[PDB]
Amino acid sequence: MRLHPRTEAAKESIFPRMSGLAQRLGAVNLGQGFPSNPPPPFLLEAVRRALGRQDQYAPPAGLPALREALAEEFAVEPESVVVTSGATEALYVLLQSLVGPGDEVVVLEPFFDVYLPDAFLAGAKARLVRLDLTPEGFRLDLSALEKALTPRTRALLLNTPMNPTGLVFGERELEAIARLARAHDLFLISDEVYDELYYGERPRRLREFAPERTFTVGSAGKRLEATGYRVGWIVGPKEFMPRLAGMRQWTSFSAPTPLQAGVAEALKLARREGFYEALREGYRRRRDLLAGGLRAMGLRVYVPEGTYFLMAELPGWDAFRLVEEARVALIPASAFYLEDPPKDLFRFAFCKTEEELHLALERLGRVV
Amino acid sequence: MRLHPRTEAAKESIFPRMSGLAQRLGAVNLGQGFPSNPPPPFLLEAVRRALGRQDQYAPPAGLPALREALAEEFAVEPESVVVTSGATEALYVLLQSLVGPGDEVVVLEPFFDVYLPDAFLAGAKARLVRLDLTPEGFRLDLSALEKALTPRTRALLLNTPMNPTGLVFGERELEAIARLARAHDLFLISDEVYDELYYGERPRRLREFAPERTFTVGSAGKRLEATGYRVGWIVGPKEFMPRLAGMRQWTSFSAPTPLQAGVAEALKLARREGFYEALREGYRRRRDLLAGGLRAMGLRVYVPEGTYFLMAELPGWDAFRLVEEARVALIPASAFYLEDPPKDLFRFAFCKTEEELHLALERLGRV
Ligand SMILES: *Cc1c(COP(=O)(O)O)cnc(C)c1O
Ligand SMILES: *Cc1c(COP(=O)(O)O)cnc(C)c1O
Ligand SMILES: O=C(O)CCc1ccccc1
Ligand SMILES: O=C(O)CCc1ccccc1
């Protein structure tokens, strides 16, 4: 007896592994992305209110109230919204529903942890388009993007705000991508879990340029500082949504009911109490704190436009040596690149307390 | 542009569909199985204490406290327990991990909604083995089981206490199954979400006769009257567990943290406070209530030994036809069989209040 060859993709992710390593070593954890603080009180109270009354199965597509709350934010009808058990499931069910053997999916490099494994589990082939890393920062070359499209290309997987670059795609880029999508009749998968976490002008969404072929992915955990609630969603053309709900039905059936209920109220309260605005400000403050502290050490730092991650170069170091000698956990570039990753490039998560960030700067400082 | 052909399986499930229909028609819902009452106080309290403390990502394999609480109940180490987002995910990840193109999987019929679609999405073929429906009740034909085995069979999927039959596999039968699996070197997938809901003698587990090849599946939702919490588990040989944690990692990454934390404490309290016994006692009454009630109407009724489901025959009746005229929702046998399903057979769910049951009997009575 033996497991199916498919399970070769079932390797423990470097993200939770680093987290365990960090707890064991007593190191400041600036690797895997999850807030050090608890979620806002209005969300906790909304969930408490749901416990005891909404504990049983919810429809696969989602609790009616959550679908309506999301529909209002996205200006679509409830039937074009499907609630999944985290954006993680949304992404898995989408690749599973859009590509298969013989199909190709374009993925930008550096990429998010689940893209390639999901592509592989769908039996599809992924074609990577590495973004250019200049002294100014990461930059997308649309020529290189177009040069990657082929007769078998069925979908394009985009992520903005982008993890780990912190890049936010501008109007001209989305327009250009929407244009290529239409010209080759491609499906557009847009991972926008950090859609409310940007530091500049509010970005425009890819779905505005190509609504008939775009699937927008969101996450309550990345919206409301509650990564462990496992509530996410897909907003896309309604004609395809019933199928997607059909697919997530077999993976986990439905998302946690009381959490879906609490999030529904929370999404509305957040919009009217200026929560996202205050959150962005709290994060910008910490982004600058980290960036400035690393600059002062004489390090090369690429200031992000979104998400709570930033990348920097620490010459002559490797993640594991750092976590043990400096007692600071970071995620190495090799985690986001398939082959030949940039030398000495690390990702920092700054969704931590200011104290934790200062502690990390002090420790990295001594070990220069 | 069109969706990949694999989406053929993405058909809306009849169970939540009938619940939506029962709600619109103001009908008593005895179809999809989910309690009318809320979960026990000690579970609600445990979740409340976790809110604000344990809200971020838990490890894919599960929160240490839950894995350990589960390991204690099963008399195994934590490394052989993996926490899934409901038993539904356990089943999907399992088939995705054990079978693929060219492999076959044996499934007993009547089956649970999730079995065939999961087999199909893994790229394997499912060979069905129908149980015999006698005047007494359902029964497995060990000969028929063995007959269905081929050189391509990689696993067998059992469900006990069985849904929808309410059948509880006896000691002798589990042993026979254990030998066949061992002889043919097959994997055994045992769906035991209703392992604490039985009405007779404490049932034995399949993993006791073949611990080396058995993966046992459980559900906090079916153990603790909280179906919407989405916390399930897989208990199996440690040699394979890391790979299973690796697979669910890509499907939903990890189960809801505060719910896991709450379930961890609740599982321990349940044992100590005799929650399961009281639960069995409460479901037995309701079982006998619905059963006797349908008898008074002179209907054919098969009493279950487990689960909160029971099957009966309603001559010349259609499910949707019934939900409109009688305003009582049930699930037709067509949902549990692939072809030529028994005539006039429906599944009833008695995990409702006595009120709802009596109401369902009345409306049914005048029909
Ligand atoms: C965190 C994250 C996800 C997954 O979100 P969940 O809701 O936690 O499953 C998906 N994509 C990106 C880019 C993320 O940062
Ligand atoms: C309810 C049920 C499941 C699914 O359990 P979840 O924990 O709700 O996902 C699986 N198998 C059987 C036989 C069930 O009755
Ligand atoms: O750290 C991350 O980039 C975000 C959290 C995460 C990591 C890996 C899988 C799912 C989510
Ligand atoms: O009613 C059922 O038998 C149990 C609940 C269920 C049904 C279908 C898919 C997942 C769960």
UniProtKB/TrEMBL annotation, chain A:
Cofactor(s) needed for function: pyridoxal 5'-phosphate
GO molecular function terms attached to this record: kynurenine-oxoglutarate transaminase activity; pyridoxal phosphate binding
Residue ranges occupied by any Aminotransferase class I/classII large domain in the UniProt entry: 28-364
Ligand binding (pyridoxal 5'-phosphate): Y57, A87, T88, F112, N163, Y194, S219, R230
Keywords: Aminotransferase, Pyridoxal phosphate, Transferase
Annotated GO CC locations: cytoplasm
InterPro entries in alphabetical order: Aminotransferase_I/II_large, Kynurenine-oxoglutarate_AT, PyrdxlP-dep_Trfase, PyrdxlP-dep_Trfase_major, PyrdxlP-dep_Trfase_small
Keyword Ion transport attached: no
Residues the record lists as N6-(pyridoxal phosphate)lysine (covalent) modifications: K222
Keyword presence, Ribonucleoprotein: no
Protein name (database record): Aminotransferase
Species assigned in the record: Thermus thermophilus
